[PDB]
Design a binder for this molecule. Structure first.
Ligand SMILES: CC(C)c1nn(-c2c(Cl)cccc2Cl)c2nc(Cc3ccc(OCCO)cc3)[nH]c(=O)c12
Lengths: 826, 329, 248
């Protein structure tokens, strides 16, 4: 068995949702921000936000909504986790003591159901009579909000429309009514139903179906002055309310997909809209009052306000202030002005909240020769793309280097005092037949520049037709100075050539240090790329020189230096190249038993291969023979997102289901079958999507640092910006920390009353296993934050083992010391 | 000639790697040196000699040579290691069963879970599976171990059943005592959970029924760790075994022993209401409790769901091979 | 695809056994003894009749490729039954076959098994499997005797006497090389034909074609009477070579 320890070094930063209401007091205006597993509660002031409370939950926050049922003084909070843990929460403050109350809770998972394509949706009735949940295709789950439903029991109503896009509870209806856009073979339609708690079924809805845009994306429930709903698409915005039908199709929104909406005026007169290019629009409902005294919706107008960060969620607060919750880039407070500035913009940025964005790749490098290490990440996407320099100093100090294009891979070349960075930018087919970039970016603002003239795929007999307006990716290699982070050079790759992998190393007997890039020819017609290049560059005297190119019959998904030879993975193949005295790559040996060799890592003559669906395989280079040998494979099927080698026997992997697992050689020589079996000895639900594993540590090493119980250091980056660290334990240390977890789980009160053991259980749609071989260091590090009575309760009857003393009783002061040493690894 | 099995050497295959672990040896992917064909080699080791040649392999050799169908895995030949000796009685060299190589297995494709299965994909998949089972059942063979891992699928959409390790002949006239613990708990019929020996071919239908449901949810239907918990899950969905629906349930050894929590009513149509009508009715008949009332393979092919499916229009499931690696922002 | 398992009588003059100086009478004797050994051993163990015959067919086929002088026959016999049991799903442990073989063999005969009987038998399994080209599936005259008798309608008692008399002839033909000369379907007909002559029955009357004097042609196409007579003559030859007489 293997023993490991996993802690968070930086909490998730990406904004996954954000709401406003009256949660902490019936009087305050609150802003609740949800980051993965983290809830932040703020109070709105005239200058910005005053933080008041932050809690963690043992689950990914999927639904977050504020509501106030009749009889409550203030808003209550509903949250549903991605593992279908539901709960209703209350804020309660006793002087200086702030705590979060679990008013109702339960798990709403169905034994049988098909998870829907557009994900979990949760909505609440305007009269707060029920909670609607769309968890499975063809089913609508209702949690009625009766006082007695403390367990959140619910029933399913059969839903004929299997493929639902979005749904909302409508305002101004005699009964609880839902409006939803659904897809069937005839296109997309907008339809309504009524929800009967007494009959527990649907009844005919208030207005008939209307055919809507094919890419109708979002549903807006408009307040009572108007009533009805608004449907946002790619090209058109439409309003429906019984017989009334409007449609505005302004050309400006066609340029970029609209992804978020939020109401400004409680009347519903004004809404905010944001699109993927970051633009912020104002949607205006023009009223006309009739002689009846009744007001009808006269027309819809769309007005461009300015530019914000590409936002997952918007929420208007008060006055002119808007909170921009971004998943791809930094979140913001922006002020909307009535008068435009001299550039025509009505939006002016107030504050900027750091978001490490998607961490696509990263490396650890000691820029200042400190024995410490700084972490350099590829963070963000599109215009939000950036490099981040991260060092410890008690908080993390983070320098941001904007790129305005998507960074893909990073690797450090010390000989050149610079970094190599792969990047891709979006251009659009323009009337010239070529393409035009939407904005300048790093690969266009480089000091010196070059463009690949390779003739390798010059025949291109197969035609690829272009239509005006279509997007394309343009990939570049950036040379970036390590002190100034100036873009010194940009190399642009071939049209339709994607840069997938990057290394910096010396090869063979060649003393020059090169940048080597692996590429794939990507055409929209191909299921899997069938052409690619390995390109050897030399960065010398401010210019990038193309040294050699090797054609391959596939995508070079991953490369790594291997004892002076170049190890590359091309589709299913894992290949080892030698670098000849003629400065060309020469193949030595191949390995073909893979579906897609997506990830490679090495140690000595050993290679760890990460496959798309076949988990991990341990290869070995056998120098006496000049070829590869299969050592051991993990036969359990796992989709890999990143791999890493922990030591000569243990191997670490990350699953697309947000899970971490550890494999080991069975080290049993009874049968050759056992040796070839990599046994999954570690299972752990991380809750984050791991893109990159990287050996190193950010802790300052003055050499005076007490040797911690933990041995080894692997950092990892995730899509939500979370950075973590994995390390190994001795059998003795694991048992202590594990026995302590079980004690802590009995003592510590969870938000929503979610069992910790449930949360960390390995979980796919098809499997759920109890965690094993992993210590939830974030749980261990919470011992220092629990009240003294609880600490002493934890240590009662706690014994140590395999130590100087075989059995040794623990005290509350004893464990505070151990945990404080464990907090010093990050 | 092509029929002189057991003599040709495994030298004739370039071994690519070990695809999986089997029952009587490891399974390897290999390329024929002469023709370039991809094959799968199952290693059979008689070195243990506790009972010499494994019977599991004997069944696979005996049955798969008789069985020729598009939806059954074709055993091509049997090859051996180099004797390395002129005299027998000193040879421990193993034998290898050559099979057609299959690109993917159904469990593997599902465990990734980003595979999308439409109605037409399921029609094409199920029809082939049932046609193969019908071929095998007309020849009076019971697979007795039908699970997702045993179904094999190559990218063309061709489905092929495999791992006939537990297959045995079924006689309707002569009732024969059987092992009674053959199918994996998740795909085991209620009759076997109740210790029913002398089982009918309808055991295989139940397993294929659980698969039918699984293809519409991407999650197996009856997931349990113990034989009682499985009967409970089946009962929550299909109804509890009782003489009202299963006259011969009283004859089954464990009927008085393994009672479920309640006498549940059948909800199969309610908990599967999101399934197309033609398919749902097929499921209800396939997941019928009484094996005498459970439909046959032929009857499944004469269903509104599978009858009019066209074998020519293979309609392969869309498998992600590009843009799967980097999740779309 | 599938191997050919049938030779001409004339070809039996060139078995390995013959060409190492064994005379025809002796090889015929060895075959009878080996077959009857298999038959007796498996009967003591309670084995189904298909399992006994399958072992015998393996044994007969084996000595078309090997000489009785290099492979002791009772070891071969024991090995055939062992595999036959696994093929036909009536398995037995090798130690149990040895135990029974020792009970039935004297001290000289059991000498063939050498110092380690179990090992000598288990080792031969590899050679047997390669020899029979892994064609494990075997059909026997029994199933055809019954399939065809079921289609006879008439005096229940006369037909049952025919069946039992023909069945005994099938059991006796396993001691011969007929298993190697003619497909089992022909054997089943041949034994029906023989029992009919001995019982003074005119089988055609029981067929769906009572004026089709060649009653068997509706069961087995393309069978010359000469072939059936050759088979019958060979069965009766075995009966005369002994002291035993026709069952009747
Ligand atoms: C011998 C033949 C019939 C066979 N057997 N099996 C099998 C079964 Cl039927 C059950 C359990 C495990 C396996 Cl490997 C099979 N799997 C499969 C699916 C399969 C599994 C792994 C593969 O790449 C491994 C990459 O390192 C590729 C394909 N493809 C077969 O051809 C086959």
């Amino acid at each position: 068995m293997s023993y490991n320890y996993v802690v968070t070094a930086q909490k998730p930063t990406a904004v996954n949702g954000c709401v406003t209401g009256h949660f902490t007091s019936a009087e305050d205006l609150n802003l609740l921000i949800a980051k993965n597993t983290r809830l932040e509660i703020y109070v709105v002031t005239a200058e910005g936000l005053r933080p008041v409370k932050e809690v963690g939950m043992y689950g990914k926050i999927a639904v977050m909504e504020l509501f106030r049922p009749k009889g409550e003084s203030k808003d209550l909070l509903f949250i549903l986790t991605a593992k279908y843990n539901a709960c209703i929460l209350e804020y309660k403050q006793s002087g200086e003591s702030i705590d979060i109350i679990t008013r109702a809770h339960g798990n709403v998972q169905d034994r049988i159901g098909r998870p829907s394509e557009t994900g979990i949706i949760g909505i609440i009735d305007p009269e707060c009579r029920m909670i609607g949940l769309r968890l499975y295709d063809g089913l609508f789950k209702v949690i009625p909000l009766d006082r007695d439903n403390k367990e959140l029991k619910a029933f399913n109503i059969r839903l004929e429309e299997l493929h639902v896009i979005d749904v909302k509870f409508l305002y101004g209806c005699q009964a609880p009514t839902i409006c939803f856009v659904y897809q069937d073979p005839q296109g997309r339609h907008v339809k309504t139903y009524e929800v009967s708690l007494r009959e527990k079924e649907f009844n005919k809805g208030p207005w008939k179906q209307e055919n809507v845009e094919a890419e109708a994306s979002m549903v807006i429930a408009v307040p009572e002055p108007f009533g009805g709903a608004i449907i946002i698409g790619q090209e058109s915005i439409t309003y429906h309310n019984g017989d009334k039908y409007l449609a505005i199709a302004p050309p400006i929104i066609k340029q970029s997909t609209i992804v978020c909406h939020n109401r400004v005026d409680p009347n519903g007169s004004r809404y905010l809209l944001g699109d993927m290019e970051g633009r912020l629009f104002m949607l205006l409902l023009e009223k006309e009052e009739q002689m009846d005294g009744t007001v009808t919706l006269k027309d819809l107008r769309v007005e461009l306000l300015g530019e914000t960060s590409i936002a997952e969620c918007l929420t208007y607060l008060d006055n002119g202030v808007v909170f921009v919750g971004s998943r791809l880039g930094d979140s913001q407070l922006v002020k909307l002005n009535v008068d435009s500035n001299e550039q025509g913009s009505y939006v002016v940025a107030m504050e900027t909240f750091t978001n490490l964005g998607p961490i696509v790749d990263m490396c650890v490098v000691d820029l200042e020769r400190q024995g410490q290490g700084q972490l350099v990440t590829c963070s963000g996407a599109f215009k939000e793309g950036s490099l981040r320099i991260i060092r410890n100093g008690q908080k993390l100090h983070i320098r941001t280097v904007p790129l305005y294009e998507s960074p893909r891979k990073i690797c450090y070349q010390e000989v050149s005092q610079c970094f190599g960075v792969l990047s891709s930018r979006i251009e659009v087919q323009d009337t010239s037949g070529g393409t035009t970039a939407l904005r300048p970016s790093a690969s266009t603002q480089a000091l010196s520049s070059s463009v690949s003239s390779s003739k390798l795929f010059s025949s291109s007999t197969a035609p690829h037709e272009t239509s005006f307006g279509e997007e394309v990716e343009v990939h570049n290699l950036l040379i970036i100075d390590q002190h100034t982070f100036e873009v010194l050079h940009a190399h642009q790759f071939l049209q339709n050539e994607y840069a997938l992998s990057l290394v910096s190393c010396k090869l063979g007997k060649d003393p020059n240090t090169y940048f080597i890039v692996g590429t794939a020819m990507v055409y929209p017609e191909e299921a899997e790329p069938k052409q690619g290049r390995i390109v050897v560059f030399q960065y010398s005297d401010g210019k990038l020189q193309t040294v050699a190119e090797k054609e391959v019959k596939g995508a070079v998904y991953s490369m790594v230096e291997f004892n002076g030879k170049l190890l590359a993975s091309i589709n299913s193949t894992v290949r080892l190249y030698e670098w000849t005295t003629e400065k060309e790559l020469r193949t030595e040996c191949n390995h073909y038993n893979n579906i897609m060799a997506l990830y490679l890592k090495t140690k000595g003559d050993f290679i760890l291969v990460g496959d798309l669906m076949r988990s991990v395989l341990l290869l070995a280079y056998k120098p006496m023979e000049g070829n590869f040998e299969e050592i051991a494979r993990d036969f359990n099927p796992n989709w890999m997102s990143a791999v890493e080698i922990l030591d000569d026997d243990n191997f670490l992997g990350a699953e697309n289901a947000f899970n971490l697992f550890v494999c080991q050689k069975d080290s049993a020589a009874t049968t050759d079958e056992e040796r070839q079996h990599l046994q999954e000895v570690g299972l752990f639900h991380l809750g984050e999507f791991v893109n990159v594993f990287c050996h190193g540590s950010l802790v300052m090493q003055n050499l005076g640092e007490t040797s911690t119980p933990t041995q080894g250091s692997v950092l990892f980056g995730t899509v939500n910006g979370m950075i973590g660290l994995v390390t190994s334990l001795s059998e003795s240390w694991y048992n202590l920390l594990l026995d302590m977890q079980n004690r802590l789980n009995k003592v510590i009160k969870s938000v929503g009353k979610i069992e910790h053991s449930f949360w960390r259980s390995f979980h796919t749609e098809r499997k759920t296993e109890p965690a094993t071989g992993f210590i939830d260091g974030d749980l261990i590090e919470s011992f220092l934050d629990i009240s003294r009575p609880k600490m002493q309760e934890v240590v009662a009857n706690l014994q140590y083992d395999d130590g100087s003393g075989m059995k040794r009783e623990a005290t509350a002061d004893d464990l505070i010391k151990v945990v404080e040493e464990l907090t010093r690894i990050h | 000639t092509e029929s002189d099995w057991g003599k040709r050497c495994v030298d004739k295959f370039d071994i690519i790697g070990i695809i999986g672990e089997g029952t009587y040896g490891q399974v390897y992917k290999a390329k024929d040196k002469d023709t370039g064909e991809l094959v799968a080699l199952k290693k059979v080791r008689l070195d243990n000699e506790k009972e010499g040649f494994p019977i599991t392999a004997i069944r696979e050799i005996k049955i798969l040579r008789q069985l020729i169908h598009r939806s059954v895995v074709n055993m091509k030949e049997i090859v051996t290691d180099k004797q390395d000796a002129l005299d027998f009685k000193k040879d421990k060299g193993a034998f290898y069963l050559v099979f057609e190589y299959m690109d993917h297995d159904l469990m593997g494709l599902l465990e990734s879970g980003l595979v999308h299965f439409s109605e037409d994909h399921i029609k094409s998949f199920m029809k082939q599976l049932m046609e193969g089972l019908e071929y095998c059942h007309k020849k009076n063979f019971l697979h007795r171990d039908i699970k997702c891992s045993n179904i094999l699928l190559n990218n063309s959409g061709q489905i092929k059943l495999a791992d006939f390790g537990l297959a045995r002949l079924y006689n309707s006239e002569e009732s024969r005592p059987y092992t009674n613990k053959v199918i994996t708990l998740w795909y085991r019929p209620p009759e076997l959970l109740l210790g029913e020996e002398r089982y009918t071919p309808a055991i295989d239908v139940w397993s294929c029924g659980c698969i039918l449901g699984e293809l519409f949810t991407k999650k197996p239907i009856f997931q349990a760790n113990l034989e009682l918990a499985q009967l409970e899950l089946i009962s929550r969905l299909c109804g509890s075994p009782c003489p009202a629906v299963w006259p011969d349930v009283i004859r089954l050894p464990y009927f008085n022993t393994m009672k479920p929590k309640k006498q549940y009513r059948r909800r199969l149509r309610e908990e599967f209401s999101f399934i197309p009508s033609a398919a749902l009715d097929l499921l209800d008949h396939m997941l019928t409790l009484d094996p005498s009332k459970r439909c046959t393979a032929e009857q499944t092919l004469q269903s509104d769901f599978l009858k009019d499916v066209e074998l020519s229009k293979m309609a392969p499931p869309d498998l992600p091979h590009w843009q799967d690696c980097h999740e779309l922002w | 695809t599938k191997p050919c398992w049938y030779w001409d009588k004339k070809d039996l003059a060139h078995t390995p056994s013959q060409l190492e100086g064994l005379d025809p009478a002796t090889e015929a004797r060895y075959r009878r003894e080996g077959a009857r050994f298999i038959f007796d051993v498996g009967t003591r163990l309670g084995l189904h009749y298909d399992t006994l015959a399958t072992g015998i067919i393996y044994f007969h086929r084996f000595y078309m490729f090997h000489s009785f002088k290099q492979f002791p026959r009772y070891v071969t016999g024991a090995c055939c039954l062992f595999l036959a049991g696994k093929v036909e799903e009536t398995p037995k442990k090798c130690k149990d076959i040895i135990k029974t073989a020792r009970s039935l063999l004297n001290d000289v005969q059991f000498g063939q098994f050498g110092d380690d009987p179990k090992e000598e038998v288990m080792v031969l399994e590899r050679i047997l499997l390669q020899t029979i080209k892994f064609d494990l599936q075997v059909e026997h005259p029994y199933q055809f005797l019954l399939k065809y008798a079921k289609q006879l309608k008439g005096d229940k008692n006369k037909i049952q006497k025919l069946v039992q008399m023909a069945w005994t002839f099938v059991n006796d033909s396993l001691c011969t090389t007929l298993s190697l000369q003619w497909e089992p379907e022909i054997i089943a007909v041949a034994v029906m034909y023989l029992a009919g002559r001995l019982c003074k029955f005119e089988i055609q009357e029981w067929t769906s074609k009572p004026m089709y004097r060649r009653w068997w042609e509706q069961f087995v196409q393309d069978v010359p009477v000469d072939v059936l007579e050759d088979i019958c003559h060979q069965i009766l030859d075995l009966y005369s070579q002994g002291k035993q007489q026709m069952p009747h």
